[PDB]
Amino acid sequence: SEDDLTKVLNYTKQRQTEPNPEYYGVAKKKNIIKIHLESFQTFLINKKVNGKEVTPFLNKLSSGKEQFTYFPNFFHQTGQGKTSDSEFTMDNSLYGLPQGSAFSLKGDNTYQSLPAILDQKQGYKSDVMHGDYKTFWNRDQVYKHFGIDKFYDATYYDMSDKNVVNLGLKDKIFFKDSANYQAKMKSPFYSHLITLTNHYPFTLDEKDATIEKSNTGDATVDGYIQTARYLDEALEEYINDLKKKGLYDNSVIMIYGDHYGISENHNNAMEKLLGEKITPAKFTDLNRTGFWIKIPGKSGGINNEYAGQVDVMPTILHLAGIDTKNYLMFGTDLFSKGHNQVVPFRNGDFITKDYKYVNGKIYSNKNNELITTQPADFEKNKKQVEKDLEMSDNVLNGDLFRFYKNPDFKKVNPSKYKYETGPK
Numbered sequence: 001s002e003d004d005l006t007k008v009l010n011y012t013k014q015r016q017t018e019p020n021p022e023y024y025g026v027a028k029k030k031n032i033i034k035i036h037l038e039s040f041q042t043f044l045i046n047k048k049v050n051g052k053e054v055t056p057f058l059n060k061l062s063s064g065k066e067q068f069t070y071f072p073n074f075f076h077q078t079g080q081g082k083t084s085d086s087e088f089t090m091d092n093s094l095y096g097l098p099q100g101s102a103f104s105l106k107g108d109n110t111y112q113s114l115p116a117i118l119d120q121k122q123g124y125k126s127d128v129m130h131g132d133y134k135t136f137w138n139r140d141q142v143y144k145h146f147g148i149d150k151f152y153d154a155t156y157y158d159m160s161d162k163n164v165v166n167l168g169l170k171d172k173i174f175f176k177d178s179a180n181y182q183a184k185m186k187s188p189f190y191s192h193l194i195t196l197t198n199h200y201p202f203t204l205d206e207k208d209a210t211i212e213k214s215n216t217g218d219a220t221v222d223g224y225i226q227t228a229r230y231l232d233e234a235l236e237e238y239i240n241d242l243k244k245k246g247l248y249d250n251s252v253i254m255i256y257g258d259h260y261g262i263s264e265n266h267n268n269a270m271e272k273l274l275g276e277k278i279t280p281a282k283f284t285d286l287n288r289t290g291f292w293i294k295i296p297g298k299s300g301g302i303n304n305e306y307a308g309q310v311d312v313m314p315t316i317l318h319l320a321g322i323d324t325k326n327y328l329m330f331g332t333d334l335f336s337k338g339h340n341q342v343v344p345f346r347n348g349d350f351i352t353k354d355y356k357y358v359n360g361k362i363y364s365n366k367n368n369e370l371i372t373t374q375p376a377d378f379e380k381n382k383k384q385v386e387k388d389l390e391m392s393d394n395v396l397n398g399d400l401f402r403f404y405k406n407p408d409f410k411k412v413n414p415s416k417y418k419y420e421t422g423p424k
């Protein structure tokens with residue numbers, strides 16, 4: 001089994017990149033705020049419905065003129081674990097499983113996670129805040145293995161009927177209360193706010209809606225317009241609150257959609273909404289879920305690098321000024337000149353700057369037209385994608401970190417973590 005670990009470690013070496021000196025260590029020991037946008041797809045960005053911008057605040061952030069760097073070609077890489085897969089990848093630079101949920105199935109594996117590294121190297125205390133109860137997706141168990149210090153679950157919020165919809169706490173109260181909790185925390189902290197309202201079936205009380213539904217006839221697509229607008233407004237107010245609390249200017253703030261909200265089941269209505277037939281290639285394009293990052297002392301902008309959620313962990317570590325040569329990671333630093341511009345998807349599809357590979361066919365990104373002459377780098381890229389997924393699965397299935405005596409990582413004792421019931 002130690003030999004199995006060795007094979008994976010060796011495999012991860014070639015892709016390693018050097019930090020961009022413009023960005024290396026610039027965020028050392030600064031608070032990091034990580035904002036999860038449930039089911040958020042960037043087709044929403046700049047989209048109007050009945051003349052109204054669905055997501056006006058995120059539209060401003062996506063302009064690059066509001067201190068955030070926006071990545072318009074940024075993809076989730078999730079599978080059946082949905083939010084839990086995104087979390088898994090964001091904090092480990094590993095893939096979830098091809099079937100089922102890594103959180104649910106591998107919750108007591110050994111990990112060398114981002115929050116644990118930040119704690120060990122720079123004294124960060126980490127938290128997750130979320131308006132659902134802690135054992136959903138096995139988070140209670142998994143977070144102890146990741147080395148997360150605090151988990152403000154639903155017991156930390158007022159879950160009365162007036163404050164809930166669908167799965168639990170409404171995003172507006174969630175963000176308001178969460179900002180108040182964050183203001184009371186000791187620095188440096190690494191805080192992850194997981195939202196909830198923009199979740200299937202995308203239902204919102206009329207009293208809470210500020211935009212009318214689209215009129216495609218598909219209740220899922222039509223409702224999504226309302227819950228997406230609601231989330232955008234919740235986020236806008238949250239950023240205001242950060243500014244009032246002195247938590248904006250000197251924080252790294254990242255925002256990301258966890259995975260697609262609208263499946264191929266809704267192709268008829270999505271063609272109406274977007275004014276284009278949803279071919280397999282087009283659906284792949286619609287898996288863009290976005291990344292926005294504000295870094296103190298750095299201007300915003302638009303960065304067109306094709307990238308996936310596996311890339312976030314090495315990016316954050318390099319921003320903090322941490323050497324990552326000994327970490328087993330599949331992603332590479334977004335700001336590094338050598339960033340590997342290949343994005344594996346869980347089903348074996350993938351995308352690059354020039355083309356996408358979808359259900360065994362190659363399409364040019366320019367026009368989504370079929371490519372019949374194999375690109376020069378296709379076999380190389382296809383092999384990387386297949387082997388990335390297999391090597392990652394080997395870590396999970398063999399629980400391979402058990403065998404890793406990492407010079408730059410002290411083994412986590414999960415029993416040292418406990419998440420107490422909140423005051424509400």
Ligand SMILES: O=P([O-])([O-])OC[C@H](O)CO
Pocket residue numbers: 081082083084132133136167194199
């Ligand atoms: O994984 P999903 O269904 O997208 O989101 C669910 C939750 O985050 C539940 O707390």
Ligand SMILES: [Mn+2]
Pocket residue numbers: 038039082083084258259
């Ligand atoms: Mn989700």
